[PDB]
TrEMBL record:
Gene name for this UniProt entry: TryX
Protein name: Tryparedoxin
Disulfide bonds: C38-C41
GO biological process: negative regulation of protein ubiquitination; negative regulation of Wnt signaling pathway
Listed PANTHER family: NUCLEOREDOXIN
Gene Ontology molecular function, alphabetical: thioredoxin-disulfide reductase (NADPH) activity
Thioredoxin domain residues: 1-143
Listed SUPFAM superfamilies: Thioredoxin-like
Superkingdom of this protein's organism: Eukaryota
Organism, as annotated: Crithidia fasciculata
Pfam families in UniProt: Thioredoxin_8
Length: 143
């Protein structure tokens, strides 16, 4: 499923180490496009962390940080503040291609896909999450 979005990437960062992309089986996967330099990201990130801590297990999803930072030691200090996963900085090319695939023109953006089928579930989770903190309408399915 996730082969389409992250061609040939087999591992993702988690805290200080990594995890196999295989460990995402069965989950809804949210790609989070953000950067340390982005002003509206600052306010949205804590809202996403709150939702994630409350619901990642019970609503069975994962978040994968897809960085738009272009400085290496930017990224790392920035991802250290997040509880979820990240595309490794060295694989920024995959992130750029993913961003184009989903027509992400601005950040923050949050796109949810089904790990197993690859189907896109929601492209507007950044807007809907802020209006639905208790996830009553999760996963905010696209028309």
């Amino acid at each position: 499923g996730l082969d389409k979005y992250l061609p040939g990437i087999e591992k993702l960062r988690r805290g200080d180490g990594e995890v196999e992309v295989k460990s995402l089986a069965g989950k809804l996967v949210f790609f989070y496009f953000s950067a340390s330099w982005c002003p509206p990201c600052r306010g949205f990130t804590p809202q996403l962390i709150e939702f994630y801590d409350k619901f990642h297990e019970s609503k069975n999803f994962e978040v994968v940080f897809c960085t738009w930072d272009e400085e290496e030691d930017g990224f790392a200090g920035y991802f250290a503040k997040m509880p979820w996963l990240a595309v490794p900085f060295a694989q920024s090319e995959a992130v750029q291609k993913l961003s184009k695939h989903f027509n992400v023109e601005s950040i923050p953006t949050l796109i949810g896909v089904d790990a197993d089928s690859g189907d896109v579930v929601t492209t507007r989770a950044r807007a809907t999450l802020v209006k639905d903190p208790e996830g009553e309408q999760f996963p905010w399915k696209d028309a």
